[PDB]
Amino acid sequence: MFQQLSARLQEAIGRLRGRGRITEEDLKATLREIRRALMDADVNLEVARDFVERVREEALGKQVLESLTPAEVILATVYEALKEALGGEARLPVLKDRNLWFLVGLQGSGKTTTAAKLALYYKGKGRRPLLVAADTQRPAAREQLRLLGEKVGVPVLEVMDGESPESIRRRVEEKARLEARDLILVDTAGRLQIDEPLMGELARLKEVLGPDEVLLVLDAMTGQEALSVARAFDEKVGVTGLVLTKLDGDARGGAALSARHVTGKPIYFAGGLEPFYPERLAGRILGMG
Ligand SMILES: [Mg+2]
């Protein structure tokens, strides 16, 4: 995962291998190399700085300068720091008896596909999901979700053009009652960029529907821009967790590695969609697969 970063971290660590004890300047050099590798992978500057300080403190705590196999001590330390940067421990949203979640994000994030994949994931766990195609301006966005629902075997309520949030609420409620739906996944409007009309409509929909989770879907390939998108969605709408898509196309990793620090939000899922496992990703970056 994250090809360029992975190669650079592995090389930085491997440079230390089979050479016996290393010097302080050797360690500092290695840290500077890791820092540059993170920077080049579009990790947020402060995240990268904190990461290497963490590694250094942890490595020195493990007596790296006395070690006869310092590369292994570095490897361990970097693994942990990666784990932590990525979220520490696997996290998922809390289901209750009934749940109504928003998916938010830019057109291009994979939001709509993600909504359908999440519905399938939770159907496999025994929930009874309902997809809601909530774009009140674009019939094609609603049709997209309708087709995906048919593919995954999950019902889809399509909002009407210009439908009020209150009417959406009523129709969703009705359908959920008639169909015993217990997980309502609202695919909100996707647009190419953030603007005030979008935000205001999302914020209003949120006031009226009262979602228990707001999942922000981000194309990881956008790098740091994703986290600026995240901050904007959080400030203007309010997010509870992230879904990162297109991780397999991301050679860099900066968004994943920076999200916890920058946004304070968990990465729930990774995009054909699985719960996000920070430890697995940390291993993959380091070549343990
Ligand atoms: Mg308000």
Tab-separated table of N, CA and C in Angstrom, residues 6-94:
chain	number	residue	atom	x	y	z
A	6	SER	N	5.977	3.490	0.932
A	6	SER	CA	6.356	2.171	1.395
A	6	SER	C	7.794	1.805	0.993
A	7	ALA	N	8.134	2.155	-0.221
A	7	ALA	CA	9.480	1.852	-0.702
A	7	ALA	C	10.526	2.686	0.055
A	8	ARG	N	10.215	3.946	0.302
A	8	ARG	CA	11.128	4.850	0.953
A	8	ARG	C	11.266	4.466	2.380
A	9	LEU	N	10.179	4.138	3.093
A	9	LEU	CA	10.333	3.701	4.468
A	9	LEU	C	11.099	2.416	4.615
A	10	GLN	N	10.830	1.481	3.719
A	10	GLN	CA	11.516	0.199	3.746
A	10	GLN	C	12.974	0.400	3.444
A	11	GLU	N	13.298	1.277	2.497
A	11	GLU	CA	14.700	1.517	2.204
A	11	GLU	C	15.440	2.196	3.355
A	12	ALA	N	14.760	3.140	4.023
A	12	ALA	CA	15.354	3.890	5.131
A	12	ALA	C	15.692	2.947	6.249
A	13	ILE	N	14.771	2.028	6.517
A	13	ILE	CA	14.982	1.020	7.549
A	13	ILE	C	16.037	0.009	7.139
A	14	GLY	N	15.903	-0.475	5.917
A	14	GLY	CA	16.868	-1.436	5.409
A	14	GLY	C	18.281	-0.927	5.359
A	15	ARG	N	18.486	0.376	5.236
A	15	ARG	CA	19.831	0.957	5.183
A	15	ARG	C	20.567	0.702	6.461
A	16	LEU	N	19.845	0.435	7.522
A	16	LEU	CA	20.430	0.307	8.842
A	16	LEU	C	20.756	-1.105	9.185
A	17	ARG	N	20.332	-2.016	8.344
A	17	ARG	CA	20.375	-3.426	8.632
A	17	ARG	C	21.750	-4.047	8.369
A	18	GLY	N	22.147	-4.992	9.237
A	18	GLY	CA	23.390	-5.752	9.078
A	18	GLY	C	24.653	-4.936	9.158
A	19	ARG	N	24.616	-3.879	9.956
A	19	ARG	CA	25.740	-2.963	10.129
A	19	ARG	C	26.095	-2.815	11.607
A	20	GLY	N	25.493	-3.619	12.491
A	20	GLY	CA	25.763	-3.519	13.917
A	20	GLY	C	25.172	-2.243	14.475
A	21	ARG	N	25.814	-1.689	15.480
A	21	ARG	CA	25.301	-0.480	16.111
A	21	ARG	C	25.431	0.721	15.235
A	22	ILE	N	24.470	1.624	15.389
A	22	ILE	CA	24.455	2.844	14.614
A	22	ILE	C	24.706	4.004	15.551
A	23	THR	N	25.142	5.101	14.946
A	23	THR	CA	25.422	6.312	15.685
A	23	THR	C	24.226	7.251	15.756
A	24	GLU	N	24.311	8.248	16.620
A	24	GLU	CA	23.252	9.227	16.754
A	24	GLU	C	23.028	9.886	15.426
A	25	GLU	N	24.088	10.170	14.682
A	25	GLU	CA	23.868	10.904	13.427
A	25	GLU	C	23.222	9.999	12.404
A	26	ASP	N	23.459	8.702	12.539
A	26	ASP	CA	22.881	7.720	11.646
A	26	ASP	C	21.373	7.705	11.924
A	27	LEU	N	21.026	7.688	13.197
A	27	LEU	CA	19.609	7.683	13.576
A	27	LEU	C	18.982	9.000	13.063
A	28	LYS	N	19.626	10.139	13.313
A	28	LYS	CA	19.042	11.413	12.897
A	28	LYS	C	18.818	11.427	11.417
A	29	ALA	N	19.773	10.920	10.679
A	29	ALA	CA	19.673	10.841	9.234
A	29	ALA	C	18.518	10.002	8.800
A	30	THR	N	18.378	8.861	9.444
A	30	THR	CA	17.307	7.980	9.114
A	30	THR	C	15.951	8.677	9.380
A	31	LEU	N	15.850	9.368	10.493
A	31	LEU	CA	14.654	10.132	10.794
A	31	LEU	C	14.373	11.228	9.797
A	32	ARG	N	15.391	11.914	9.342
A	32	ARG	CA	15.200	12.952	8.349
A	32	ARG	C	14.712	12.305	7.068
A	33	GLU	N	15.214	11.130	6.720
A	33	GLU	CA	14.759	10.450	5.568
A	33	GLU	C	13.295	10.036	5.692
A	34	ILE	N	12.919	9.523	6.854
A	34	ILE	CA	11.524	9.175	7.044
A	34	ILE	C	10.660	10.411	6.920
A	35	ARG	N	11.076	11.504	7.550
A	35	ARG	CA	10.305	12.747	7.447
A	35	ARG	C	10.096	13.191	5.998
A	36	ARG	N	11.162	13.150	5.199
A	36	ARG	CA	11.068	13.553	3.804
A	36	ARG	C	10.142	12.602	3.064
A	37	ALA	N	10.207	11.331	3.394
A	37	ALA	CA	9.372	10.378	2.722
A	37	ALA	C	7.874	10.685	3.037
A	38	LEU	N	7.570	10.974	4.280
A	38	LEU	CA	6.202	11.314	4.648
A	38	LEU	C	5.761	12.584	3.903
A	39	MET	N	6.619	13.631	3.949
A	39	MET	CA	6.333	14.907	3.290
A	39	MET	C	6.000	14.625	1.827
A	40	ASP	N	6.828	13.832	1.152
A	40	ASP	CA	6.655	13.574	-0.248
A	40	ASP	C	5.401	12.758	-0.524
A	41	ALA	N	4.887	12.056	0.477
A	41	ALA	CA	3.674	11.296	0.372
A	41	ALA	C	2.427	12.159	0.719
A	42	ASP	N	2.617	13.478	0.816
A	42	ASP	CA	1.540	14.408	1.099
A	42	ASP	C	0.961	14.257	2.490
A	43	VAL	N	1.788	13.762	3.387
A	43	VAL	CA	1.377	13.801	4.787
A	43	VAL	C	1.479	15.217	5.246
A	44	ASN	N	0.524	15.639	6.030
A	44	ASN	CA	0.481	16.975	6.567
A	44	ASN	C	1.798	17.235	7.313
A	45	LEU	N	2.340	18.440	7.120
A	45	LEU	CA	3.593	18.795	7.698
A	45	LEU	C	3.731	18.530	9.181
A	46	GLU	N	2.710	18.909	9.938
A	46	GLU	CA	2.759	18.729	11.373
A	46	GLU	C	2.671	17.266	11.757
A	47	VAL	N	1.870	16.524	11.008
A	47	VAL	CA	1.790	15.089	11.217
A	47	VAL	C	3.126	14.446	11.006
A	48	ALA	N	3.816	14.808	9.925
A	48	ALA	CA	5.115	14.222	9.605
A	48	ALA	C	6.137	14.549	10.704
A	49	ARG	N	6.156	15.766	11.150
A	49	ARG	CA	7.046	16.166	12.196
A	49	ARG	C	6.764	15.410	13.458
A	50	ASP	N	5.500	15.309	13.838
A	50	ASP	CA	5.151	14.561	15.035
A	50	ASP	C	5.483	13.097	14.948
A	51	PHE	N	5.313	12.544	13.778
A	51	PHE	CA	5.582	11.128	13.536
A	51	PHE	C	7.031	10.841	13.814
A	52	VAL	N	7.956	11.607	13.230
A	52	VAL	CA	9.339	11.300	13.479
A	52	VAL	C	9.758	11.586	14.888
A	53	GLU	N	9.200	12.606	15.516
A	53	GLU	CA	9.533	12.830	16.922
A	53	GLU	C	9.071	11.620	17.732
A	54	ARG	N	7.910	11.060	17.425
A	54	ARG	CA	7.441	9.900	18.099
A	54	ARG	C	8.392	8.747	17.938
A	55	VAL	N	8.775	8.498	16.708
A	55	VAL	CA	9.726	7.429	16.417
A	55	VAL	C	10.991	7.629	17.160
A	56	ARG	N	11.514	8.830	17.145
A	56	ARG	CA	12.773	9.054	17.818
A	56	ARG	C	12.621	8.763	19.309
A	57	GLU	N	11.593	9.295	19.958
A	57	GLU	CA	11.422	9.099	21.390
A	57	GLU	C	11.263	7.637	21.720
A	58	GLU	N	10.478	6.956	20.898
A	58	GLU	CA	10.210	5.546	21.161
A	58	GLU	C	11.452	4.692	20.953
A	59	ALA	N	12.169	4.958	19.885
A	59	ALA	CA	13.402	4.259	19.573
A	59	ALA	C	14.454	4.462	20.632
A	60	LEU	N	14.607	5.707	21.071
A	60	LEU	CA	15.550	5.949	22.153
A	60	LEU	C	15.095	5.291	23.457
A	61	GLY	N	13.794	5.169	23.679
A	61	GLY	CA	13.251	4.499	24.842
A	61	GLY	C	13.577	3.028	24.786
A	62	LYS	N	13.682	2.467	23.582
A	62	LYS	CA	14.059	1.063	23.324
A	62	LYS	C	15.559	0.906	23.179
A	63	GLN	N	16.324	1.938	23.559
A	63	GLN	CA	17.800	1.856	23.534
A	63	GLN	C	18.381	1.540	22.154
A	64	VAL	N	17.838	2.209	21.128
A	64	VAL	CA	18.269	1.972	19.775
A	64	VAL	C	19.752	2.135	19.528
A	65	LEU	N	20.407	3.035	20.225
A	65	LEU	CA	21.838	3.260	19.993
A	65	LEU	C	22.720	2.202	20.583
A	66	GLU	N	22.147	1.402	21.465
A	66	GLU	CA	22.892	0.253	22.042
A	66	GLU	C	22.594	-0.980	21.269
A	67	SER	N	21.514	-1.026	20.512
A	67	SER	CA	21.095	-2.234	19.829
A	67	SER	C	22.067	-2.734	18.807
A	68	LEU	N	22.239	-4.060	18.818
A	68	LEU	CA	22.996	-4.729	17.812
A	68	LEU	C	22.208	-4.928	16.524
A	69	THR	N	20.879	-4.697	16.554
A	69	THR	CA	20.001	-4.813	15.372
A	69	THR	C	19.034	-3.595	15.371
A	70	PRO	N	19.601	-2.424	15.196
A	70	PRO	CA	18.825	-1.200	15.278
A	70	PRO	C	17.745	-1.129	14.206
A	71	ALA	N	17.947	-1.730	13.060
A	71	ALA	CA	16.909	-1.661	12.040
A	71	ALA	C	15.631	-2.280	12.539
A	72	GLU	N	15.732	-3.341	13.304
A	72	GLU	CA	14.523	-3.973	13.818
A	72	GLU	C	13.779	-3.147	14.843
A	73	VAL	N	14.546	-2.430	15.643
A	73	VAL	CA	13.986	-1.530	16.596
A	73	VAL	C	13.272	-0.372	15.829
A	74	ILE	N	13.919	0.163	14.813
A	74	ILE	CA	13.268	1.189	14.005
A	74	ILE	C	12.003	0.646	13.380
A	75	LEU	N	12.105	-0.535	12.784
A	75	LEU	CA	10.936	-1.112	12.107
A	75	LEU	C	9.775	-1.178	13.078
A	76	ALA	N	9.994	-1.697	14.264
A	76	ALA	CA	8.931	-1.827	15.255
A	76	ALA	C	8.325	-0.504	15.593
A	77	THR	N	9.182	0.473	15.735
A	77	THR	CA	8.759	1.769	16.168
A	77	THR	C	7.923	2.467	15.086
A	78	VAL	N	8.405	2.349	13.849
A	78	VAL	CA	7.702	2.918	12.746
A	78	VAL	C	6.354	2.229	12.540
A	79	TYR	N	6.295	0.905	12.699
A	79	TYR	CA	5.042	0.195	12.626
A	79	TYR	C	4.038	0.784	13.613
A	80	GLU	N	4.459	0.941	14.863
A	80	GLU	CA	3.573	1.488	15.874
A	80	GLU	C	3.122	2.889	15.539
A	81	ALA	N	4.055	3.718	15.094
A	81	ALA	CA	3.718	5.088	14.784
A	81	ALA	C	2.729	5.153	13.617
A	82	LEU	N	2.896	4.292	12.612
A	82	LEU	CA	1.988	4.182	11.494
A	82	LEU	C	0.623	3.774	12.010
A	83	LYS	N	0.583	2.725	12.852
A	83	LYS	CA	-0.662	2.177	13.457
A	83	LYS	C	-1.410	3.356	14.031
A	84	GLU	N	-0.696	4.060	14.887
A	84	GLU	CA	-1.294	5.170	15.621
A	84	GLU	C	-1.739	6.297	14.668
A	85	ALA	N	-0.959	6.630	13.696
A	85	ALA	CA	-1.321	7.706	12.802
A	85	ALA	C	-2.631	7.342	12.096
A	86	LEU	N	-2.775	6.054	11.751
A	86	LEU	CA	-3.884	5.554	11.010
A	86	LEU	C	-5.146	5.345	11.822
A	87	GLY	N	-5.078	5.445	13.127
A	87	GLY	CA	-6.190	5.328	13.991
A	87	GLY	C	-6.034	4.521	15.201
A	88	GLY	N	-4.940	3.802	15.347
A	88	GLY	CA	-4.675	3.110	16.537
A	88	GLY	C	-5.225	1.741	16.535
A	89	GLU	N	-6.501	1.644	16.554
A	89	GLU	CA	-7.280	0.400	16.713
A	89	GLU	C	-8.521	0.544	15.750
A	90	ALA	N	-8.941	-0.555	15.144
A	90	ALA	CA	-10.125	-0.616	14.308
A	90	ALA	C	-11.342	-0.109	15.051
A	91	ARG	N	-12.125	0.771	14.418
A	91	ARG	CA	-13.315	1.386	14.970
A	91	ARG	C	-14.487	1.296	13.990
A	92	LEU	N	-15.694	1.058	14.495
A	92	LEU	CA	-16.921	1.090	13.647
A	92	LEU	C	-17.977	1.857	14.325
A	93	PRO	N	-18.931	2.380	13.521
A	93	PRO	CA	-20.045	3.082	14.153
A	93	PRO	C	-20.913	2.148	15.043
A	94	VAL	N	-21.584	2.744	16.041
A	94	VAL	CA	-22.396	2.039	16.984
A	94	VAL	C	-23.787	1.901	16.377
